[PDB]
Structure 1
Amino acid sequence: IRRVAISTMVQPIFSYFIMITILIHCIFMIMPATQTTYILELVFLSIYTIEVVVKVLARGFILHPFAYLRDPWNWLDFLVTLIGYITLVVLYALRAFRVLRSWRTVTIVPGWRTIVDALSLSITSLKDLVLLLLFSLSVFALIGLQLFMGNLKHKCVKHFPADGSWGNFTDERWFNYTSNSSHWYIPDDWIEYPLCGNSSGAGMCPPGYTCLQGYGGNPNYGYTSFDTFGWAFLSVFRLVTLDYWEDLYQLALRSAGPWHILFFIIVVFYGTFCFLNFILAVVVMSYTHMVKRADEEKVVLSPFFELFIAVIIVLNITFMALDHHDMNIEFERILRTGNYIFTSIYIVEAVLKIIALSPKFYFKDSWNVFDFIIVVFAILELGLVFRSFRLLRVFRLAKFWPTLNNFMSVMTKSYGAFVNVMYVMFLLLFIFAIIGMQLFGMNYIDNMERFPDGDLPRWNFTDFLHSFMIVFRALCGEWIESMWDCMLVGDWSCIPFFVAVFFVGNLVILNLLIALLLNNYGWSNIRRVCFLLAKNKYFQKFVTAVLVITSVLLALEDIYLPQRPVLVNITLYVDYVLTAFFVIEMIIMLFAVGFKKYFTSKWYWLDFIVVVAYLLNFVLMCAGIEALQTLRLLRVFRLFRPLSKVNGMQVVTSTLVEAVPHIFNVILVGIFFWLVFAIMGVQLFAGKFYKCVDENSTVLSHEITMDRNDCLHENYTWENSPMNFDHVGNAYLSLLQVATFKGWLQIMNDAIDSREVHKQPIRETNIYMYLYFIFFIVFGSFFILKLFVCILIDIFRQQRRKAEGLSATDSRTQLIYRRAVMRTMSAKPVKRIPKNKIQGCIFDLVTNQAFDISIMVLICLNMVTMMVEKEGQSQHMTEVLYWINVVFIILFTGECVLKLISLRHYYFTVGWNIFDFVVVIISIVGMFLADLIETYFVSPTLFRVIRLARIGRILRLVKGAKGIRLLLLALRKALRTLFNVSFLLFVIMFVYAVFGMEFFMHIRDAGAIDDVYNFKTFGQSIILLFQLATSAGWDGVYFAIANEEDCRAPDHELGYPGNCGSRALGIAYLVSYLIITCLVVINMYAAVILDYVLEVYEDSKEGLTDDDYDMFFEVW
């Protein structure tokens, strides 16, 4: 018995047999069930049971150190087998998790142990971050609950008819009329009722309507609000993750007022730019530790011909990129003839090289094998669709292009780790797809009526392909809309599922991928006086002040300016004065530093360009020609030099300046790869996004209009999609929309509906086109776009080393030791006296640990009391809650009084004591103020705002938490640099705000631009640009500002400005903004955070921390 089992388990054939069985079982899990599946399930279960029996007979069960159930993997196997028997003999919710056995297949890929260990270490290291995350989210949920409670229910309700059609006024008849949903404003074909508010700057109502509270439901089937702590929690988590967050942001600003933008800024700054970067830092440290452990453990043959072939390759690529939809016949002939010529040249090259060199030596070269494969494919293509393989020719450019060559060699050097990570990602997606299919698939079929028109949504769980696509989309960062659908037809189980998918896929696996990338990709007197004046402090301060004031004046030139004559005059006068000022300043600087210094400096060149622009505008105005707006807007660029001199800014600007060349190289490589995908996209989809519509832009059925001829015979419209693959430029724009995941859903809907040209698309007739986008997303968004962060991280570390005056050649250990030696230099001990029988007794009672723990418990209880508040509660409940809060305030005041009585003046030697003392004083003053306000009823919003001080007494809960204290210390050390980065971001936003006001203030309402969100004033422009800095909603903004169709041109004689945008201008504006902010400046936060977190953690683990010195001086 025992001998057989012991020999059987160690035989490799046994392990391969089990693995192959698991693989076929997974395959059968993908396909639809049938009676044959039931018997195959029994076969698989028998095989797994035999494995369990063999291993128990070989090891024993638990009682010894090396028994069967001392290995976690065996725990997985055993629990899944038991679940299988349980579900076979006797809830279907348990039948899914047999797919968990597939996790074992991770052990097939060589080098799997490193990645699995890194994942395990990352998961175990998030312990303190989870607690801090939950606390922060709760605090923000409370703040949002008190600020936005009830706002998302606002609606425009028609006035009670004075005509008497609804009867004479009575309170009952008025309530009866206002509650009828047919009297609530909603534009035709809309799903959601628009929000409103009567505060200055909120959404307005049409005439005959008033903005009311308490009617109807909240947005998104009632799932989006701040009416309870739980929904507020959900909304805050959504906001931190940036998941469709522009919609909640616009809803709140439209119902509450633009000033509530402040709330969103705070949440985005703390939660997105700091905390998720803590998560990334933990993942990076874990991976670095594992890799450290692993590593420690241990004619034709001439340059001229090469150049000739290189230019021929470039010309062939150009010819390939020129292909487009509905080409004229001459264009087609030219391209075809060019193809013939290129193929002939490649054939000649192959033969010449094979004969000049030996055939044996010819096929010993990898590049030669690649070229021969290309020649074979080309000749096969011309002989006989093999055109898709023509793209291989593009990759020959890597032989001649050193940057691309190095990029390729780096990938070759470490392909194994990336293979492991991608396999883990896809295995996780497969497991979740199967689980979600079993849990939710039948809900969509059974409860289809609940959907807006009773139709199945594009994204569902009805079969394996759709389930995989929806979980993959969640991994890309979009989870909440799918969760709304799941809840609508399901129950609470949808919430944990999607959250888990998002957390594991996005915050762990993708972060691990970027960690891999980082690890791998990483007269004489006149000159005298002018010189003295130029170097003088006061003169520079005066110049800076003038620049700042006139730049602020630019922000006031909004759409209302023509109605304000005094402002018009002030701006004109300021323009004249600035012209004189710039000229005189240029002369002074020239006399100070001279011609050669002046004209070899980039700063002085910027100044000179501004001087020339203002002189040109002056000459134009003299001639009677209206000044160019762009030229006089160029003066804002003067702000950057004084900005670069702010305290602590030098590290940030040095990092960006040093990073520019690498960023450019990455952009070039990305353009190359995107060219490959764009040519493929044109080949697949060019000309196929046309469809037949009617007066309402509603797609007709193919059963009615089969093709273009039917469409036009019935006098319908054969309209193209604004985003398409008709030529390479449009393909590039569509691929940018895909990679950023902004507007990609419509593009993919068109792609999977596509049929041959001139035919009516059919829903999901070409579903497997999804594979195209998956590949692009893996190689364009997960790989190429994440290099920017790695570059910034690597460069910022070096620049900070420069700033602190540290040597570059020193090792990390030496710096750790120097840090400890610096700490020991500045530590000292403190003692306090225990007072006086009464005071001494109170001292003994207050200095004990029980007292502090009790204070913590009281804080937790007060926090729960705050969580009880909800929308619609009776006023009696409001009063009871306020009185309970009063009790808590009295208790904390008493704590402070006792501590003061005990410690006398020593009390203020501890910083936390000072914070608590300030909070107590503020609470007393606030109680007085609240009583006065509530009695005199100043304003409900004012009361809500001043109630924000209540959070002060809850923030003390972090006192004494060591793990949380470490991360807060890291954040404190980084605060200066984070602030400087934020300041730079805001200045860039200001520049873009004023140029956007100039370019787009008059455009018609379309897409995301409407009466509330637009470029009409500086504030509204900033509201839009803060949203756009995260790339959120930029597709709708582009659709608005790029529209050149169906518009009125300006009438200079009549003064009418016109109302439509510019495709080229909008493309330039938005693409440049996305690159500068989303891909560069925002990633600086991650760089800074990572450096500081790493420092503190290494101090904790391989050195000494301030707490070590504190403990040493506790004894002393």
Structure 2
Amino acid sequence: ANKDRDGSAHPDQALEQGSRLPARMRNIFPAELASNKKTFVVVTKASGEKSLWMLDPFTPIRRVAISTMVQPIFSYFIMITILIHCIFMIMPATQTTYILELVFLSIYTIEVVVKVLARGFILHPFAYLRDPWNWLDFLVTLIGYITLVVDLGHLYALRAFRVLRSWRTVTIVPGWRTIVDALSLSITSLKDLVLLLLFSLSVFALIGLQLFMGNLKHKCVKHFPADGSWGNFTDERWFNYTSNSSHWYIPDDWIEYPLCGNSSGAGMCPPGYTCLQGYGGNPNYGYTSFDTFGWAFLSVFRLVTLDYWEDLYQLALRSAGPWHILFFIIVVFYGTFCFLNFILAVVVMSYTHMVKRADEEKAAECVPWQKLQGAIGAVVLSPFFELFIAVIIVLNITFMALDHHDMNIEFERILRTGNYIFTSIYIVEAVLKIIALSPKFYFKDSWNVFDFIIVVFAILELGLEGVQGLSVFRSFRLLRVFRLAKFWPTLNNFMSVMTKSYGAFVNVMYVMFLLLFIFAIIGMQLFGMNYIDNMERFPDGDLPRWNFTDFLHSFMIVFRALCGEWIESMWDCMLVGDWSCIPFFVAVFFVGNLVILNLLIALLLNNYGSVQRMWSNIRRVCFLLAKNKYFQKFVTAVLVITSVLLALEDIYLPQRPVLVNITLYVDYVLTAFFVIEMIIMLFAVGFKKYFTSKWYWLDFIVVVAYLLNFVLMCAGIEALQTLRLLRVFRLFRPLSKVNGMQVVTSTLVEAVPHIFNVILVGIFFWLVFAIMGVQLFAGKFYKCVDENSTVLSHEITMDRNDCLHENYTWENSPMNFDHVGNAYLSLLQVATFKGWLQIMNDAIDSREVHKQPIRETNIYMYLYFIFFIVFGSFFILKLFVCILIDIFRQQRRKAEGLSATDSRTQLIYRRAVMRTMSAKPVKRIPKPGNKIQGCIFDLVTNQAFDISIMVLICLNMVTMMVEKEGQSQHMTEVLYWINVVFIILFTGECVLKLISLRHYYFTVGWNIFDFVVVIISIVGMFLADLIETYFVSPTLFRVIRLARIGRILRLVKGAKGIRLLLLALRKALRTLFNVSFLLFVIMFVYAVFGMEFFMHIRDAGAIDDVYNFKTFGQSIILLFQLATSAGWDGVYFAIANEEDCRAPDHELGYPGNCGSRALGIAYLVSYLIITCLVVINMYAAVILDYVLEVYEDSKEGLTDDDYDMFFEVWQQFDPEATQYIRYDQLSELLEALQPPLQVQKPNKYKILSMNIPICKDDHIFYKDVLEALVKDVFSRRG
């Protein structure tokens, strides 16, 4: 439609496009319309469409107006002034800077007056401004105006929103258009799933409001008033007593009250108190309870977004009882592992659709001197020397990464002389290679300059510390390590593929930093002041470590909200300002993580992807038995049933004295069974085809283990435990043959060799960061602490000597940077966002060795963790997902037939043509037997009845959103008697529909679901009499009624996008189930191996007599939490303690009570890889592969709807029985369909065109017509 404006409609005015001004006019003042400097613009082609048809350029001021409109320097002047304006904005206040702000305000007004006067009188300021840049540059300056003629008139909440001028600068760095519009399209498409997200959060909050209505208030109160002192009343004064807070139970120096509950297996708080309900107070200042709708919405959004959820988990389970985890699973599997990936799918799709246009457009275009020169040349490029220098730089990397903290003098001199030797050989062989060849081709390789640079640095480091320069170049000494890039092929490829496609990364990083800069300034101006005026509602009257007071702290808190954690800062904000802290943080999370970080993942994904007789007879008979189905079912069943029994080996096994005997008998018969079946199959398959096979080696290892364990009776030594648990692993062999677990195991076992390569590259980069973290922080982190765990401030203990003066102990903090090992550990803590606060605090405060740290100095050393986290967590750990998506796609394809040589486009046509086998039509039987009884259906099928019902659903869903704890007595009865009206109306309506069309009621799924739901409602309304004849317990009446919630999810019916996404989710369910199955078997293995190592532990950190490893149930209660790497710092600090232990005695009542450290490090770091990074991402891979396919099927091919909405015609366009037509109505049949499968009425020549085989005289079968239409629409669109 470009010719429309390139025509007599409303002509152009002028253009520049690089040094030529061809003006367009009213055609009666023609000048420069050719298309000598201009006919080269043709050559330049071999832009400002002004749209000013309002009035005339008659050489008024409008001339110079246009002349300055498009100009090389105007926009540049504006942009430089914006940059300097914001860099003044960064510093809070200054006297008389006010008048400067007046200049910076009045530049923009001349900028807008010229840009407007050059474009009309008033009329087109109504038509053409639809480009939003002008909207921005207009609204913000009008805000600047209104702020200046009110004189601080109690409105400082909008003087901040001027900073979003600076977005205008995103267009200064090249290659910026193919990213911005990507965000635009992603938002414009993400709307559709926003709707479903909203509805689903709502129904989950409604479910949670029923099960947990006001039990997070439970407290522990002393038994009775007393027998004595408090009096004699034992009546209403009782209520005066049990409300005086000062005898609720707080252990010591806490500020939260522990929760009790009195179900089975939770709380039971002291002996001497009792667990009372409903005495004021909620955890976290009163922002957590489920006791009304809004707070339930907040907590369920907190669960879905997967942020600091271990707190709510532990609270809810402490209160109600462990079975309640059957709730959390449902909101995690559906909301976080299966819904927050619809967003990833949408963003990836939009980005890969916007990159294609751009890239296709780009792709559419002394003589012995030289004698010994040859000699040394022979002795330089010889392959000896590359080997030699590679080995020497490896030994250099080794000698530059020891650096203990104390480091005895021998290490000192050793490392010194080593550095000397290494710099010497570097310099000498570099210079002799200089004199070996090419005194000037040398600087012509773009790779040897690096060596000269590092040599210069080594030399100057040798010098200026030989003089009194303190820390001159030992930092740049690190740069050796990157020289190890000529030798690895993997690392060389990883480097090249980024170094020669790099505009995208720069642009994305710039957008990211600019966005959170904008947010930081808005914050510093908006909340700001409230942290100093009030300043005392906090616990101990002092600014928390994270606050909006200076620019730096503000930047940091918005960054911390971007990386994933946004809730623990919302409480503080909302504690000093009543509201307007919720939209801010929810927005900075939503346009933060979920959009930009998903855009980054969408960018690493298209750049990095005679007795012999009976000898033979026995062989034959074992061969015959070994393959019978029943024997295989038997062995599988015996494995499963002897494995499940391995669970109930918990604490107080001895107190059940019969179990020990039965389990010993079981393991005896087990070792017999194993050794027998090995003989059987060993005669069966044959020797040499039994050791080279992978699976059978598992059986060999387990049988040799059971053998070595059995013979340990002649020695009388008791059977060692860790061997008799190797039984679990055989459980992996049958698992691999469930119908639909070929894809998952095949893709894992093919993905492994890439996982390992990425692990290696990550090890390398983290080494580069750690051997610097050591020299920056090693030796600090010490602190002087009293008998308690508190730090003497600054003057009671200035440095170490004073700390040892009066016996104040001199403690160390656990996570520190002494070795290189602890560096890896603490960095793995920083880069998974768990327990990364104490490290940053102690790293901020480190002043200098042997001296007490000050509360906040050395603050600029945040920049270490930011540059580490951008290059170690948004870039590497997000690369594991980008190798399971590709591999899963390839494996599904190559495992469902469908040969892999068809180029991604004819597969759509294939699925379309394949869809044409389930095409049976049908007709509704019209009308019942006699008139009035049948006169009911005549309207039940109408556009104003189901719509007249789908409002009752919404009204009912509102009347369930009012309940709250503390309802006055009258309210509950009116709600009760208002439910019955609906519960009878629904069944009345359903029975009318059913008695209308007498039979045939069950040909649709929705009718079946409605019938089931309504009978469930009508029986649940009665069974609400759970009182007076059955156990009167809250946690059963509170669940039996949930049935009423079923009749509201009927609301999703009818919307087409909210049906397309659900079709996508349903088309991939067996595979998703199988992935969850594998995750649970892994959790079972780890639970069993845990119940043995970590059963007796000293309570510390995060092990609180309800979340220990003692029994099986609590073991899974803990491991389901650790599966998402939520709170592993506490569990690690608890199981890896090795101080005061009371080591076992092996003499009487054998205790444990300390654990260890080796298999503490080796038990978690191998559970944050098998689970947190390799399976939880397979969820995303599967659902992304299915959603992307259903979209690209809808937008181009034929959707699942088109066929049945085609069938609507021919459903009530011909009768039921015969599937035939006689060629006449056929014609205007193509006038009763819809644009996808139809052509307009001039079709008789096309009906002549297509060859639909006329069958019997005048019967036309349908598949012919429909196939013709399918290939016709594929011909028209393509």
Q: So what's the TM-score if we normalise by structure 1?
A: 0.99
**Is the CA contact (8 Å cut-off) linking 1:1001 and 1:1016 kept in structure 2?**
yes
Structure 1 residues 404, 696: closer, same or farther in 2, change over 3 A?
same
Partner deviation per Cα, 1:456-503 (whole Å, 9 max, x = no partner): 110111111011101101110000000011001112100011000111
More relative contact order, 1 or 2 (CA 8 Å, 6+ apart): 1
Answer whether contact 2:706 2:724 (CA < 8 A) is retained: yes
Q: Residue 608 of structure 2 corresponds to which residue in structure 1?
A: 521
Give me the whole-angstrom Cα distance separating, in 2, the residues matched to 1:525 and 1:723. Answer: 67
Counterparts in 2 of 1:438 and 1:1063: CA distance versus 1, 3 Å: same
Deviation at 1:830, TM superposition (A): 2.0
Runs of at least 5 residues in structure 1 that lack an aligned partner in the other structure? none
CA contact (8 A) 2:885 2:1182 kept: yes
Equivalent-residue separation in structure 2 for 1:303 and 1:876 (angstroms): 93
8 A contact 2:219–2:276 mirrored in 1: yes
CA distance in structure 1 between the partners assigned to 2:528 and 2:742 by the alignment: 56
Offset at 1:613?
0.9
1:638 deviates by 0.7
Equivalent pair of 2:225/2:241 in contact (CA under 8 Å) = no
Residues 198 and 204 in structure 1, CA contact (< 8 A), matched pair in contact too: yes
Whether the 8 Å CA contact 1:111–1:416 is kept in 2: the answer is: yes
Q: CA deviation at 1:839?
A: 4.3
Between the aligned partners of 1:834 and 1:61, the Cα distance in structure 2 is: 66
> Do the aligned residues in 1 keep the contact of 2:1026 with 2:1032 (CA within 8 Å)?
no
Question: Offset of 1:933 from its aligned partner?
Answer: 4.2
**In structure 2, what is the Cα distance between the partners aligned to 1:65 and 1:54?**
13
Distance 1:643 1:684, change over 3 A: same
Tell me how far apart the structure 2 counterparts of residues 61 and 755 of structure 1 sit (CA, whole Å).
Answer: 66
- Residues 932, 682 of structure 1: alpha-carbon distance in 2 compared, 3 angstrom cutoff: closer
Q: Deviations over 1:908-959 (max 9, x none)?
A: 1111111111101111111221135477663221011112212210110111
- State which drifts further: 829-838 or 6-15: 829-838
Any conservation in 1 of the 2:1026–2:1037 contact (CA below 8 Å)? no
Residue of structure 2 in register with 1:277 after alignment: 341
Q: Which moved more, 1:451-460 or 1:1046-1055?
A: 1046-1055
Distance 1:934 1:706 in 2: 71
Report what 1:486 is aligned to: 573
Aligned pairs, number: 1114
CA distances 1:493-524 after superposition (whole Å, capped 9, x unpaired): 00011000111110000000000001111121
Distance, in Å, in 2 between the alignment partners of 1:745 and 1:1021 is 27
CA offsets per residue over residues 669-697 of structure 1, 9 Å max, x none?
A: 00000001111110111010000101111
Query: Contact 1:1041 / 1:1061 at 8 angstroms: preserved in 2?
Result: yes
What corresponds to 2:441 in structure 1? 361
**Could you tell me how far apart the structure 2 residues matched to 1:197 and 1:932 are?**
21
CA contact (8 A) 1:59 1:68 kept: no
Deviation track 1:423-454 (CA, whole Å, cap 9, x = no partner) reads 11101110000011111111111111010111
Closer, same or farther in 2 for the Cα pair 1:896/1:679, shift >3 Å? Answer: same
Distance 2:723 2:819 in 1: 35
- The whole-number CA distance in structure 1 between the counterparts of 2:537 and 2:622 is 79
Percent identical among aligned pairs is 100
Match of 1:953? 1047
Q: Deviations over 1:364-413 (max 9, x none)?
A: 12220111111111111111x21111221111112111111111111112
1:584-628 deviation digits (Å, cap 9, x = unpaired): 111111111111111011110011111111111111244211212
- Please tell me whether the aligned partners of residues 68 and 74 of structure 1 are also in contact (alpha carbons under 8 angstroms): no
Residues 890 and 935 of structure 1: is their aligned pair in 2 closer, same or farther, counting only changes over 3 Å?
Answer: farther
Contact between 1:62 and 1:70, CA under 8 Å: does it hold in 2? no
Distance between the aligned counterparts of 1:216 and 1:328, measured in 2? 60
In 2, are the aligned partners of 1:444 and 1:489 still within 8 Å (CA)? yes
Shift, 1:348, TM fit: 1.4
**CA distance in 2 between partners of 1:324 and 1:611 (Å):** 46
Q: Which has the higher helix share?
A: 1
Distance 1:167 1:63 in 2: 87
- 8 Å Cα contact 1:753-1:765 kept in structure 2: yes
Residue 541 of structure 1, CA deviation: 0.8
Shift, 1:201, TM fit: 1.1
Tell me the CA shift for residue 833 of structure 1. Answer: 2.8
Given that 1:61 and 1:67 are in contact with CA atoms closer than 8 Å, whether structure 2 keeps it comes out as: no
Structure 2 length normalisation: TM-score?
Answer: 0.86
CA distance in 2, matches of 1:689, 1:633: 42
**Cα distance per residue 1:207-239 (max 9 Å; x no partner):** 111111111311110001101110010000000
CA root-mean-square deviation:
1.3
Contact 2:221-2:249 at 8 Å conserved across structures = yes
In the alignment, which residue of structure 1 is the partner of 2:165? 101
Counterpart secondary structure, 1:94:
coil
Tell which deviates more after alignment, 1009-1018 or 161-170.
161-170
Aligned residues of 1:154 and 1:214 also touching (Cα < 8 A): yes
Q: CA shift at 1:258, angstroms?
A: 0.6
CA distance in 2, matches of 1:689, 1:1059: 28
1:618 is matched with which residue? 710
Tell me, what secondary structure is at the counterpart of 1:198?
coil
**What is the CA distance between 1:1029 and its match in structure 2?**
0.6
SS of the residue corresponding to residue 360 of structure 1 reads coil
Deviation track 1:1029-1051 (CA, whole Å, cap 9, x = no partner) reads 10000000000000001221011
Deviations, residues 785-810 of structure 1 (Å, cap 9, x unaligned): 01100101110001111221121221
CA distance in 1, matches of 2:83, 2:943: 57
- Structure 2 residue corresponding to 1:1019, chosen from 1109, 1113, 1118: 1113
Please identify, of 1073-1082 and 153-162, the stretch whose mean Cα deviation from structure 2 is larger: 153-162
1:153–1:214 contact (8 Å) kept in structure 2: yes
Q: Which runs of 5+ in 2 are unaligned?
A: 1-60, 362-378, 464-471, 610-614, 1211-1278
Residue deviations 1:284-322, cap 9 Å, x none? 00100001121122x222221111111111111111111
Within a 5 Å distance, the mapping from 1:315-330 to structure 2 comes to 315-330=395-410
Instruction: Tell me how far 1:831 sits from its aligned partner.
Output: 1.5
2: CA distance between counterparts of 1:1090 and 1:304?
A: 50
From the superposition, tell whether residues 495 and 1049 of structure 1 become closer, same or farther in structure 2 (CA, over 3 Å).
same
- Contact 1:62/1:69 (<8 A) preserved: no
Residue 542 of structure 1: how far off its partner (Å): 0.8
User: What is the CA distance between 1:65 and its match in structure 2?
Assistant: 8.9
SS in 2 for 1:101: helix
1:199 positional shift: 0.7
CA distance in 1, matches of 2:382, 2:233: 98
**Structure 1 residue aligned with 2:598, among 486, 492, 511?**
511
Partner of 1:422: 509
Shift of 1:77: 1.2
Is 1:25 matched with 2:57? no
Residues 497 and 62 (structure 1), Cα distance of their counterparts in 2 relative to 1, 3 Å cut: farther
Structure 1 residues 693 and 940: CA distance shift in structure 2, 3 A: same
Cα distance, 1:61 vs structure 2: 7.5
Equivalent-residue separation in structure 1 for 2:1027 and 2:681 (angstroms): 58
Classify the secondary structure of the residue corresponding to 1:1030: coil
**Structure number with bigger Rg:** 2
Q: Distance in 2 between matches of 1:386 and 1:749?
A: 28
Mark the CA change 1:253 to 1:622 in structure 2 (over 3 Å): closer, same or farther.
farther
Does the C-alpha gap of structure 1 residues 807 and 13 become closer, same or farther in structure 2, counting only changes over 3 Å? same
Q: Name the CA distance, whole Å, in 2 between partners of 1:720 and 1:487.
A: 36
- Report the Cα distance in structure 2 between the residues aligned to 1:875 and 1:606, rounded to whole angstroms: 66
- Contact 1:196 1:255 (C-alpha < 8 Å) held by counterparts: yes
Residues 60 and 68 in structure 1, CA contact (< 8 A), matched pair in contact too = no
In structure 2, C-alpha distance between the alignment counterparts of 1:285 and 1:1071, rounded to whole Å: 34
Aligned-pair distance for 1:840? Answer: 4.4
Whether the 8 Å CA contact 2:743–2:891 is kept in 1: the answer is yes
Tell me, in whole angstroms, the C-alpha distance in 1 between the residues paired with 2:718 and 2:984. 68
1:4 aligns with 2:44: no
Contact 2:1021–2:1041 under 8 Å retained in 1: no
Q: How many angstroms does 1:746 deviate by?
A: 0.5
Tell me, yes or no, if the aligned pair for 1:96 and 1:438 is still in contact at 8 Å: yes
Q: Is contact 1:56–1:68 with CA below 8 Å preserved after alignment? A: no
In the TM superposition, residue 35 of structure 1 has moved relative to its aligned partner by 2.1
Deviation at 1:46, TM superposition (A): 0.8
Residue 844 (structure 1) shift = 2.4
